[PDB]
Design a protein around this ligand. Structure first.
Ligand code: M5T
Ligand code: MG
Length: 215
């Protein structure tokens, strides 16, 4: 198994209310876990636990290897669009091109005279919310890792663009990779190997889309 949580309870503040309560799941290598739930349910906190920023007060956690994290808040640093996506990782033309195509950034980049050398984050170009989200997603996906933590990465995208990139990037380009995707969208839960729905820290549902349909 690649990631396990067993009876996990955790607190951000000593003596506060638990942010996660008796959470259970397992992800095998190469699978996709969808993590859903309302605002404040604990989804980002669950990712933080996997990244070692929050320790369990009860329960056990298993995860090994290197992590790539995509924040739900998209961000850009001063530099070219290519530099923002590679972000200090060694460069490979084929890998880079595959990521930007899977994130629909080829269209955006082709429109600039400077192409992949267009400069971001320095007062020239002002990116849309959807461009910044796809660049942030591409940055996380370009990075080689054992586990990809994609926290609501489709911000500002219309539902068809979100669907297309979920399929081209999360399902096809990343098909061999262990993935945790924070998302509420029905198709994403249906395509996931497992679903975890959080509500106020607790496991509202854990299982498969098919199991939920049978209920
Ligand atoms: C990430 C984080 C969260 N919290 C608290 O934990 C609860 C759950 O918050 P969440 O996990 O961010 O909820 P979410 O499911 O990701 O919500 P959303 O991103 O709005 O969909 C909230 O009390 C937050 O204050 C902290 O105190 N410190 C933190 O660093
Ligand atoms: Mg969050």
């Amino acid at each position: 198994t690649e990631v396990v949580m067993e009876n996990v309870t955790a607190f951000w503040e000593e003596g506060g209310t638990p942010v996660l309560k008796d959470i259970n799941f397992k992800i095998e290598r190469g699978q996709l876990l969808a993590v859903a739930g309302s605002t404040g349910a604990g989804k980002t906190s669950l990712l933080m636990m996997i990244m070692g920023e929050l320790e369990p007060s009860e329960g056990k956690i298993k995860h090994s290897g290197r992590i790539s994290f995509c924040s739900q808040f998209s961000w850009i640093m001063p530099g070219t669009i290519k530099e923002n996506i590679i972000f200090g990782v060694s460069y490979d033309e084929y890998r880079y091109r595959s990521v930007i195509k899977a994130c629909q950034l080829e269209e955006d980049i082709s429109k600039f005279a400077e192409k992949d050398n267009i400069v971001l984050g320095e007062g020239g170009i002002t990116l849309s919310g959807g461009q910044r989200a796809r660049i942030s997603l591409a940055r996380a996906v370009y990075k080689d890792a054992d586990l990809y933590l994609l926290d609501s990465p489709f911000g500002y995208l219309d539902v068809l663009t979100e669907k297309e990139i979920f399929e081209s990037c999360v399902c096809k380009l990343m098909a061999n990779k262990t993935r945790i995707l924070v998302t509420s969208k029905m198709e994403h839960l249906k395509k996931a190997d497992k679903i975890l729905i959080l509500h106020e820290g607790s496991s509202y549902f854990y299982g498969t889309f098919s199991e939920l349909q049978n209920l």
